[PDB]
Symmetry: D6
Subunit: 160 residues, 12 copies
Amino acid sequence: STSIGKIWLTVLFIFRIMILVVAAKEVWGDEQADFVCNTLQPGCKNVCYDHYFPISHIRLWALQLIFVSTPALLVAMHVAWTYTSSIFFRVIFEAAFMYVFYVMYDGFSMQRLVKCNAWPCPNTVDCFVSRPTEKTVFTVFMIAVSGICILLNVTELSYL
Amino acid sequence: STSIGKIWLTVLFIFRIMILVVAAKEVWGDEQADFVCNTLQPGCKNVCYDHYFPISHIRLWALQLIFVSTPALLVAMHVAWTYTSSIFFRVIFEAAFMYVFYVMYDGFSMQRLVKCNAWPCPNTVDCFVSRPTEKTVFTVFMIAVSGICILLNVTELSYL
Amino acid sequence: STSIGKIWLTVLFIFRIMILVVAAKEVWGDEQADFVCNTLQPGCKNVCYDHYFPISHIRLWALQLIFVSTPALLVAMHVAWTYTSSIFFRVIFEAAFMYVFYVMYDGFSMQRLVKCNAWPCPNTVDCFVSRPTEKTVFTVFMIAVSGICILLNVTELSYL
Amino acid sequence: STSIGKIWLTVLFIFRIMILVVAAKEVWGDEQADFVCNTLQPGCKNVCYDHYFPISHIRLWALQLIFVSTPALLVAMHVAWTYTSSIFFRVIFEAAFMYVFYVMYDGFSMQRLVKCNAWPCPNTVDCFVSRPTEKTVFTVFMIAVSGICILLNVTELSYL
Amino acid sequence: STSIGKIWLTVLFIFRIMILVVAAKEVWGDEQADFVCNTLQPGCKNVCYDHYFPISHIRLWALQLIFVSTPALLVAMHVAWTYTSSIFFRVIFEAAFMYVFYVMYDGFSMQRLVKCNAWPCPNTVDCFVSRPTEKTVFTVFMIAVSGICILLNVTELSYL
Amino acid sequence: STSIGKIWLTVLFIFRIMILVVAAKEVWGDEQADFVCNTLQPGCKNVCYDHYFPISHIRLWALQLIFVSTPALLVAMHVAWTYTSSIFFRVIFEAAFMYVFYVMYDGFSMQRLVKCNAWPCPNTVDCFVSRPTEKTVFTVFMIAVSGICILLNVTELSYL
Amino acid sequence: STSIGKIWLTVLFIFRIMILVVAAKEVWGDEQADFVCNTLQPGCKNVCYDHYFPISHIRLWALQLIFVSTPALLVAMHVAWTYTSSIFFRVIFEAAFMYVFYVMYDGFSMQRLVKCNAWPCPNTVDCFVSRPTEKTVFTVFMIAVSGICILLNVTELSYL
Amino acid sequence: STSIGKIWLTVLFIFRIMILVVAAKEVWGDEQADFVCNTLQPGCKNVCYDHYFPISHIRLWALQLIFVSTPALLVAMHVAWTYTSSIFFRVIFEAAFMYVFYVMYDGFSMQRLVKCNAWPCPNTVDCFVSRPTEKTVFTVFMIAVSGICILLNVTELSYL
Amino acid sequence: STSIGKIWLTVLFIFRIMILVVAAKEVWGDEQADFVCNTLQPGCKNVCYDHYFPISHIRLWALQLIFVSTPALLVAMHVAWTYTSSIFFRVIFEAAFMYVFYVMYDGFSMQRLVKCNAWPCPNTVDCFVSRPTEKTVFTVFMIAVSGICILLNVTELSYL
Amino acid sequence: STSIGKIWLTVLFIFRIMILVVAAKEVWGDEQADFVCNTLQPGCKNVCYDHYFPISHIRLWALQLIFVSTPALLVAMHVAWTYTSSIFFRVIFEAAFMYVFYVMYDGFSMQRLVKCNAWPCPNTVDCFVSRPTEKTVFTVFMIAVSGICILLNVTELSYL
Amino acid sequence: STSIGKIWLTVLFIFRIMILVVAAKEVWGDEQADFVCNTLQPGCKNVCYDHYFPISHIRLWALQLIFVSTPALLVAMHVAWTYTSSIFFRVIFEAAFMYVFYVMYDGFSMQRLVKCNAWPCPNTVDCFVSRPTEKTVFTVFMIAVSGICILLNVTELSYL
Amino acid sequence: STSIGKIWLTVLFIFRIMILVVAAKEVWGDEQADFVCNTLQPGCKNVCYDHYFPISHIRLWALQLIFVSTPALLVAMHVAWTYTSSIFFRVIFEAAFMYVFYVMYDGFSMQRLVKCNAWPCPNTVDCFVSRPTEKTVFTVFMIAVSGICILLNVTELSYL
C-alpha cells in the first residue's frame, strides 16, 4: 500500500546512475574542442564557452545525486524522528538543483547557435555548440526522473 | 515445456550487453571527428551531424536495456499478479524503442553519403559518415535479438 | 583418455580472450586515423576504408567468441541429449566465422597498399593501411586456435 | 550528544572523494591544451602555465585527502593518548593546505585573463585560461567541506 | 634446498606482469604518432614503421607470458609424469621468444635513427623513432628475468 | 618501543603508491607532445627529449617500489636469519635508485629551458619542457619518503 | 556644321584607351585569385570562373577597340566610295560587341554572389567575385562611350 | 596680369600626374590583400571591401584628370566662344568629382577600423584597412590642388 | 585588282601582334600556379603540366610570327625571282605551325579536366586547367587569321 | 666664378632621380609583407606599420623632388625679379621636407625592433622591420644631397 | 656573292634578341618557386637548385649576346686590319659559351627528375624541375642560331 | 696609340649597365623570401639577413656606376686642367667601392650556409641563402671590369 516509494527511489537512483555513466564521458567529454566559433580572435572560444556553460549538465547532476544520496548514508549510520528530516532534506535539494538548472539554462532545449559579446570577442560573434539535440534529450530524462522522485518523496513524506 | 524463455531472456540479456560493451566505445566513439563535410563553412559539420544523428544508436540501445531491465529489479524487490504486469511493460518498452529506431533511421541500412541543407550550410552539401556498413551490421544483430525477446515475451505472456 | 578437450577448450578460450584484450584496443584502435590516402578529395578516405574493411578483425572475432561461448552458458542453465547439440552448434559457428573471414579478407596476408575506385574517389587511388604485417600475425594465431578448437570439437563430438 | 563528528567526518570524507573523482579527470584534464596565449613565441605557453599554476587544484586536494586520511590508517593499526595526537595532526594538515591554497591562488575566484611577463615571452602577453568559473565553484565546495571538517575536528578535540 | 624455484617463478611471474602493465600502455602507446620521417611522401611513415617494427616489444612479451603461463593453468586442472612435461614446454617457449626477439631486433640497443628504402619511400629516407634509450632499458630488464627464469627452470628440471 | 617502523613502512608504502597513481598518468602523460623545440629541423625533438630524459621519473620510481616491495613478497613465502637479509636488500635498492636519480637529474629542480646540441639538431637549440615546477615538487615528496624509509630501515636493521 | 564627329571619334577613341590602360591591369588583374569559393573541392574554382567568365570584360573591349580602329588604318593606306564602307563596318562591329556583351553578361550589374553547379562542384556552391560594383561602373562608362560612338557614326553615315 | 592661370593649370596638371604615378601603383596596389578581417567566414572580406570601397581613390582621380583634360584636347582640334565653354565644363567636372569624393568618403580622414554587417558576414565584424594615414595625406594633396584649380578656373572664367 | 593582299598582310600582321600583346601576358601568365591537381604527391603538378603543355600557345604563335615575318626583313635587304621564294617560305612556315598546333592540341577546344598517369603521379589523377574556354576563343581568332593569311598568300603566289 | 651652382643643381637633380628610381621600387616595395609582428592578433600588423610609418621615405622624397622641381618649370614658362623668388621657394621647400623628415623619423638610424601599443594590439608587442640598415644608408645619401643643394642655393641666392 | 653574312648576322642578331625577350621573363622567371623537392628539410631546395643550376640558361645567353655584340660597337668607333680581329673574337666567344653550355648541362635535354645529395639534404632526394621540355626546345633554337652564326663567321673570315 | 681607353671606358660602361639590368631584377629580386632559416623564432630571418647583407651587391654597384659616371656629366657641362681632376675622382671612387665590397663580403665566394647569433635568434642558427654560386659569378664579372677600368684609367691618367 505505502513505502513502495522506497523501491521506486532505489530503482530511479540506480537508473540515474546508469543514465549518467553510460552517456557520461561519451557525450559531454568532447564539449570543449567542439565549440566552433567563427573568429580568429584568440581566447574568444574559452570566454564564450565559460559564458554559456558556467557548469556542464553532468556536473550539476552528479552533485545532485550526491546531495540526494547523502541523507541515505546519513540515516544508515545514526546510532550504534530523523527519518522525516533526512527525507525533507532529500526533497529540498532535488528541487533546488532543478531550479538552478532552469535558471542557468533557459528551459530544456539547447540552441544550436549562440551569439557572444564578451571582451576578447570584438563584437557579437556566432559560436556553434556540439550535438544540442541529444543533450536536450538526456536533460528531459533526468529532469523527468527528478520530478518523479520529488512527487513520490512528497507523497510519502505526507504520510502523517 | 514453458518458461524456457526465462533462460533465453537471461542469455540474450547478457548477450546484448556483451555485443554493446565490446563494440560500444570502439565503433561509435570516433563518430564525431569522422564526419567529413566538403565545405569550408564553419559549423556546418556539427549542424549536419546533429541533423542526421539526434541520437547515436548505442545510446538508444543502452536506454532500451535499462528500461527493459528495470522490471527485473522491480519484480525482485516487491515485498519483504505483478509478474504479468512487469512482463507487459517489458514488451511495450522494447517495441517502442524499435519503433523510434526505424523512424529516426529510415530502415537498417546506413547511407554512405548524406546531403544537408541546414542554415550555416549555404546549400545542399555532401557530408560523409564513417563506416556505415559495420554499424548497419550491428543494428541487424541488436534488432534481431530485440525481435526474439519480443516474440518469446509475447508467447510466455500468453500462457493464460 | 577422452574429454581432455574440455581442458583444451577452457585453455584456448581464456587464451583467445587474452590474445584479444591485450592487443585488442592497442593495435586496431588507431585504424581510422592511419589510412593515409594520396588524394585531396574529401571523403575518399572513409569510402575506401569502408570498402576494404566492412568489419575490423577484432569485431568478427569478438562475436565468434560470444557465439561459441553462448552454448556454454546455454548448457549450464538447462534445468533447475542437449550436450551433443550445444557442441554441434559450437562447431558450426566457429567454422562459419572462419569462412566469412577468408571471404572478406582474401587469405591471411594484409596488403600494404590498396587501390580504390569508389565514387568520391575520382579514379584508382592509392591508399595505405597501418601495420599490415602485425595484424596478419595476430590473424595467424587466432585462426590457428580456431582450427585447433574445431578439430578437438569434431573428434570428441565423434565419441559415438 | 558527542562524536557525531565521527559520522560527519566519514560522510565528508567519502563526499570529498566523490566530488573529486567525478569532476576529477573531467575538468582539469584538458587544462594544458586550453591555455590559449596570444603569441607566436614558442614556449611562452608552458612558461606562463607553470607560472600561474605551479600545482593544479586537484593535486593539492588529493594530497590533502591523503595526509588527512593517513592518521586514520595510523590509528587503526597501533598495537596487535594516541587518539588526540592523530586528531591534532588531522587538524594542522587540513589548515596547512588551506593556507597554501589561498597563498598560491589569491582568493577563490579564477581570473579569466592572466597577463604574463616571463623570459621567452617578449613582453606582457595575454593568456586565457579554461572554464575559470566552474573551477572556482568546485573550489568553493572543497574549501567549504574543509572548513566544516576543521570546525568539527577542533570542537571534538576540545572535549577535555 | 630444492624447489625454491617455485617461489622465484611466482616472484618473477608477478614481477614481469608489473613491469609490463606499469610501463605497458605508457611507453609504447605513443609509438605510432612519434615516428617522425623526414619526407612529404604520404604513406612512407606506415611503411617504414611496419618494416622495422613487425611487432612491438610489448606484444611479443605479453604472448611469452601467456605461453609460459599456459602450462601452469594446464597442470592445475589435469584430473578431477606431466609435471616435467609442462616444465619442459615452459623452457622451450621462453627460449623461443628470446630467439625471435634477438632476430627481429639486432641486439638489445634501439638505434635513434633508422634509414628506409621501401616502395612509397622514394629513396633512403631518415626516420626517427621515439625514446629508443628507455625501451632498450626495459628490454634489458625483461630479457634478464627471462634468462633467470630459464636457468632456474633448467636446473630444477635437471633434478633427476 | 621498536618495530613501529613496520607500520611506518606500510603507511609510506601505500602513501607512495597513492602519490604516484593519482599524479601518475595525469602529469607526465603529456610529456612527449609538450616539449616545444624552437626549430623546424625534424627529429630534433625526439633526440633532445631522449637526451635529457633517458627515463621519466615515474618509471624509475615505479621500479623502485617494485624492487623494494619484492623482499616483502619474498619473506612472506619462504617455507610451507632471512629477515635481516631481505631488510638489507630493502636498504640498498632504495639508496641505489636515489643515487641514480640524482645522477641522471642534476639535483631536484627541473630547469624550464634546456639547450641541446645533438646530431639532427644543427646547433645549440632551445627546447622547453612542460611544468618543470610541479614535477620538481613531486620529486621532493618522493625523495622525502625515500629518505624516511631509509632512515627507519637502517635504525631497525641496527636492532642488534 | 558636319564631321565634328571626326573630332568626337578621336576624342572618345583616346578616351577609351585611357579608361582601359589606367584601370586595365589594376582592376581585373587580380580576378583569378579573388574568386573565393566556399568548398574544399579542388578545381571547382577554375570551373565556376570559366563558367561565369568565358571572357573578362577588358579583353572583349580591347578587341572592340581593335576591330573598330582597323577601318582607320584601313582607310589611311588605300592607294599610293571606300569611306562609307569602312564607316559602316565601324558601325556593325561596335554594335556586335555590345550585343555579345549583354548576352554573356545579363545586363550591366555584376552580382556579388554567384551559384555554381558544374561537375567537380558537388552541388550548387556559393562563389564570391571581387569588386563587382566597381567593374559595373567601368562597364557603364565604356558602354556609354560605345552608344555615343554608334549614334554619331550612324548620323554622319546618314549624310546622304 | 591675367592668364597666369594657364601656367598654373599646366603646372598643377603635370603635378597631379606625377603625384599619382609615383604613389599610384605603390600605395593602393596592395589594397586587396591587406584588408584583414577578423573572421573565418569566407567571402566576408570581398563583401566588406566592396562595401566601404566601391571605388579606390586613384581611379576616381584618374577619371577626374581625364574629364578635366578632355576639354584641352577638345579645344586644341576645333577647326582646320568655345574657349569659355570648354573652361566651364572644366569647372563643373572638377567640382563634381570633389562632391562624389566627399559623399563616398565621409571627409578626408581614413578610419583605421571599419565595422561591417553585410550578408555572408554573420554580424558586425571588425575589418582593418591598410595604411589609412598615408592615403589620407595624399587625399589632402589632391583635393588641395583640386580647390586651387577650381579657384583659378573660376576667376579667369570671370574675366568678362 | 591584285596585291591588295599586301595590305591585308600588313593589316593582319599588326592585328596578330595586337591580339597577342594585349592578351599575351594577361591570360597565360598565370598558367603555372592555376593547374590545380587533386593530389598531395609532390611534383605531379609540374609533370602533368609538362605533359599536356609541352609549349604554351603564345610561344608557338610568337615563333610563327617571327618565321613568317623573317621573309619580310629578308626581302627588304637583298642588294645595296626572290619575291616568289620568300613568299613560298611564308606559306610553308604558316602551314607548318598550324599542323604542329593541331597535333599537340587535339582540335581547338581546351578540355576543362585532364587526367594524368605519369611517374610521380601514383595513378590516373584529375588535374584542372585554368580558363580553358577563353584560351580556346583566342585560338579560334589566331587560327582564323592564319587561314586567311594562307589563302591570300596562296592566291597571290598563284599570279602566274 | 658664380652660378656653377646651376650645374651642381642639375647634377644633383639627376643624381637624386637616379638614386631613387634604381633603389626606388626594389627596396621599399616589399615593406608591407616584411613587418613581422610576434602576435596572432589580426590587424596589429597594419596598425603598427601605419603607426611608425605614416609615410614611406620614398614618397616624402618624391614629393620633395616635385616641389623643388616645380619652380624650374615655373620659371621656364613665365612670358611669351622672379628668379630670386622661385629660388627662395626652392630653399624653403627643401628645408621643410628635411624638418618633417627628422620629426617623423627620430634621426637617420632605423631601429631594428619597434614596440607597439595600439588598440587591436593587446599590449606592447615586438614588431620587426625589414632591412633597417640599408634604408638608413640611402637616407644618409639623400639628406646629404639635400644639405648640399640647400647650401649652394643659399649662397647663390646671397649674390646681392 | 660574299658578305651576305653581314645580313644574316643582323637577322640572327635581332632574331636571338626577340627569341629571348619574348620567352625571357615568361619561362625561367618562375624557376625558383617551381622546384618541388620531396623533403621537409629546410634549405635543401636552394642547395639543390644551386647545384644543378649554377646559372640559368637565359643569363649565359644574354652574356653571349653582349660579348658577341661588343666587337660591333668596338669596330664602329675606332677612329674619328681591325675588321678580321673583331671578327675572330666574335668567333671564339660564341664557341666558348657553346662549350660552357654543354659542360654545365650534359647535352640539350632537361631531365624531368634530378636527384640530389648535398649537405642539408639528408640523403639522395628527388627534386622536380619545371617545364623541362619547353626549355630544351628553346635551347635547341638558340644553339642552332649559334652554330649558324659560327659557320657563317668562319667562312667569311676565311675570305683570304 | 693613346686614348683608346676612352673607347674601352664607353664599352665597359655600357657593358656594366647591360650586365646589371639583365640580371638586375631577375637574380637578387627574390633575395628576401629565399633566406630559409631553420627556426620558428619570429624575426630571426630579417635580423640575420640584415646582418650578413647590410647592402645587396646590386645597390653598391649601381651607386658605383653613378659616382663613376658623374664626372662624365660633370666634364660635359663646364663652360658655355679639369680633365685630369674628373679622371682622378673617377679612379678613387671605383677603388673605394672595390674596397668596401671586399670588406663587407669577405672575398668573392658566397657561402651556402651562414650561421647567426643575433638577439631574437636564441643561439647560433643555420640560415640558408639563395643561389650563392651564381651571384659569386656575377661578382667576378663586375669586379673584373672594375679592375680593367681602374688600370686603363690609371695608365691614361699617367700620360704626363
